[PDB]
């Protein structure tokens, strides 16, 4: 389950489909009017995402938007290629926009110092902004800290009349380059703290974590064969991601002293 490894795609819930790699989440939100892709995985993983969208029975030219959680190489590395294959517009938090256009992180970024291909057609979303495509409506929530422009994305998908609130959860992890210190960046720390609070408040029936194992994707999926898509449903999921971020940050800060 490497960041770039092939992964047979699958429906998570209604029109929410997993099209990512074995190690990085990418989600296709489909409609007869066109689709929204969330994240591009790695540069190598772009080929997997492209193959996966087609294996689900969709056309790449019908993807009108690519949404970015945060601009690290493992989630955004493949966005440039996906943008080229689709002609989509790329949407990101204001502070990660330039990282996505160029491929180079800002010095503030905990993982500043690897690069990746820059993408055309990037523009910023506002916190709370609604991204619209036909019947689709995806809301941006600023969740900074792991990066400054981190966005967690929410929508609803309905399966056989049963509608659920879906959250594509950006990373809330206090991890960085080996030389970076969260102890030296109190505003980054304060951002992460705000984000835990913001995420655990989200209406959250189905959580898809940018790192899929953060909400047990592989386990839930295996169970999905037996009990159907209710296996991905767990409304404590966003609270659990936030709690794990919180505990992880306390651990990181202590270890840095
Ligand atoms: Na694949
Ligand atoms: Na973003
Ligand atoms: Zn990251
Ligand atoms: Zn990552």
* Ligand number with the minimum distance to the CA of 172: 3
Nearest to 108 by CA among 144, 80, 143: 144
Residue 141, marked binder? no
* Ligand number with the minimum distance to the CA of 147: 3
Residue 35, marked binder? no
CB 131 within 8 A of CB 77: no
Beta bridge partners of 152: 141
**What count of other Cβ atoms lies within 10 Å of the Cβ of residue 200?**
18
Cα separation of 6 and 224, whole Å? Answer: 20
**Separation of CA 257 and ligand 2 centre (Å):** 31
Query: Domain 1-257 adopts which CATH fold?
Result: Metallo-beta-lactamase; Chain A (3.60.15)
Question: For the purposes of burial, counting CB atoms within 10 Å of the CB of 248, is it exposed (0-12), middle (13-18) or buried (19 or more)?
Answer: middle
| Resolution stated for this PDB structure, in Å | 2.2
Query: What's the CA angle centered on 148, arms 142 and 149, to 5 degrees?
Result: 50
**Separation of CA 50 and ligand 1 centre (Å):** 9
Cα separation of 82 and 201, whole Å? Answer: 32
**Separation of CA 22 and ligand 1 centre (Å):** 8
Residue 211, marked binder? yes
**Judging by DSSP bridges, how do beta strands 89-93 and 122-125 pair with one another?**
parallel
Buried b (16+ CB within 10 A) or exposed e, 54-91: eebebebebbbbbbbbbbbbbbbbbbbbbbebbebbbb
**Separation of CA 213 and ligand 3 centre (Å):** 14
Cα separation of 20 and 47, whole Å? Answer: 10
Return the percent helix, strand and coil in the chain, to nearest 5.
35, 25, 40
Sorted by where each begins, the domain ranges of the chain are: 1-257
Experimental method for this entry?
Answer: X-ray
């Amino acid at each position: 389950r490497d960041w770039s490894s092939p992964q047979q795609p699958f429906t998570i819930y209604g029109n929410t489909h997993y099209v990512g790699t074995g190690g990085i989440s990418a989600v296709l939100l489909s409609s007869p009017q066109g689709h929204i892709l969330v994240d591009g995985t790695t540069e190598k993983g772009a080929q997997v995402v492209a193959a996966n969208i087609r294996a689900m029975g969709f056309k790449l030219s019908d993807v009108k938007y690519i949404l970015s959680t945060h601009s690290h190489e493992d989630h955004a590395g493949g966005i440039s290629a996906m943008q080229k294959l689709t002609g989509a517009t790329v949407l990101a938090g204001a502070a990660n926009v330039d990282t996505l256009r160029t491929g180079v992180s800002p010095k503030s970024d905990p993982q500043f110092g690897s690069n990746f291909p820059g993408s055309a057609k990037v523009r910023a979303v506002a916190d709370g902004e609604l991204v619209k495509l036909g019947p689709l409506a995806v809301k941006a929530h600023a969740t900074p800290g792991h990066t400054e422009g981190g966005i967690t994305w929410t929508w609803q998908s309905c399966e056989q009349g049963k509608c659920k609130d879906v959250v594509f959860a950006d990373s809330l992890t206090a991890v960085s380059a080996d030389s970076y210190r969260f102890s030296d960046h109190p505003e980054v720390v304060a951002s992460l703290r705000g984000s835990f609070e913001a995420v655990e408040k989200l209406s959250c029936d189905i959580a898809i974590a940018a790192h899929p194992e953060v909400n047990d994707m592989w386990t839930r999926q295996q169970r999905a064969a037996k009990e159907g898509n209710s296996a991905y449903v767990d409304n404590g999921a966003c609270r659990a991601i936030a709690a794990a971020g919180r505990k992880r940050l306390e651990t990181r800060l202590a270890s840095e002293k």
